[PDB]
């Protein structure tokens, strides 16, 4: 069904990325000079920090300039809603392309079809494109991460001659919020050789990685960054978090961290260019 209040499509998890990319390229979207994915995290409330706003404004401006694809969760609650609102504002002012990928089961209201979705999770209507994964139907745990990672890896495998970047289209992961899902996404991106940029100074896991960029120090940083999260998390959760931290830090050159001191203009662009 097409949400109107863009295009929302329900696709199974076991879907070949090649077919989706061919569909998008043939008649829906043009070749993408750049592609950036943002992992907001489990939290549905995004704190409008003094610095995060400018960072993401610069990110969206860069994406518009380069005609990039912005991938997010698409949830109307949290950072994704802010990104969608900023995309709509820029559109009101070359078209920006935003894809929100989520799980159909977690969606609160399901409308089948040109059915219109009008306001359990809620998705932002600002996003121009949306994808709903459905393998564990009516399943609380998130399952879109696998498809997102597979699609990102396939797009990395692609090759565009027009782009100045040699061969494959550039892809940059982004991490501003903390959470287990964010850490898993960072691990998958690192295993995929696609660089990720972590916003140091904001978020729990992001700041932990920034400080790391051993095991006891990692645990102490994780506890300090998210006291409530570490207190609620069990010992097995802490062990898994430390394992993922060690796995991601094994490849430091890929990950890039924005310095807390660095707060000038065009810092996001500089960091992304350095990572690429």
């Amino acid at each position: 069904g097409d949400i109107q209040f863009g295009k929302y499509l329900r696709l199974s998890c076991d879907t070949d990325s090649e077919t989706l990319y061919e569909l998008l390229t043939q008649h829906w979207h043009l070749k993408t000079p750049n592609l950036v994915i943002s992992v907001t995290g489990g939290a549905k409330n995004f704190a409008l920090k003094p610095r995060m706003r400018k960072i993401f404004s610069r990110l969206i401006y860069i994406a518009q300039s380069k005609g990039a694809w912005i991938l997010t969760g698409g949830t109307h609650y949290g950072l994704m809603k802010y990104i969608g609102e900023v995309v709509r504002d820029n559109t009101i002012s070359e078209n920006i392309v935003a894809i929100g990928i989520a799980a159909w089961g977690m969606v609160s209201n399901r409308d089948t079809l040109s059915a219109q979705y009008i306001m359990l999770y809620i998705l932002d209507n600002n996003h121009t494109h949306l994808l709903l994964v459905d393998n564990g139907c009516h399943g609380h745990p998130t399952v879109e991460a696998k498809l997102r990672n597979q699609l990102e890896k396939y797009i990395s495998e692609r090759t565009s001659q027009d782009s100045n970047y040699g061969g494959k289209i550039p892809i940059v992961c982004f991490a501003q919020g903390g959470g287990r899902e964010t850490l898993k996404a960072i691990n998958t991106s690192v295993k995929s050789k696609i660089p990720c940029v972590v916003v140091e100074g904001s978020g729990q896991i992001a700041d932990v990685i920034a400080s790391l960029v051993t095991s006891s120090m990692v645990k102490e940083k994780l506890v300090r960054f998210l006291p409530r999260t570490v207190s609620r998390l069990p010992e097995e959760e802490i062990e898994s978090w430390i394992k993922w931290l060690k796995e991601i830090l094994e490849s430091s050159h890929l990950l890039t961290v924005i310095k807390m001191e660095e707060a000038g203009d065009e810092i996001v662009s500089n960091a992304i260019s350095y990572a690429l």
Binding site: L9, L11, S12, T15, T19, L20, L23
Partner: peptide, 10 residues
């Protein structure tokens, strides 16, 4: 067309 393409894809 578009509906047929979507059905073929899935």
């Amino acid at each position: 067309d578009l509906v047929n393409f979507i059905q073929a894809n899935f």
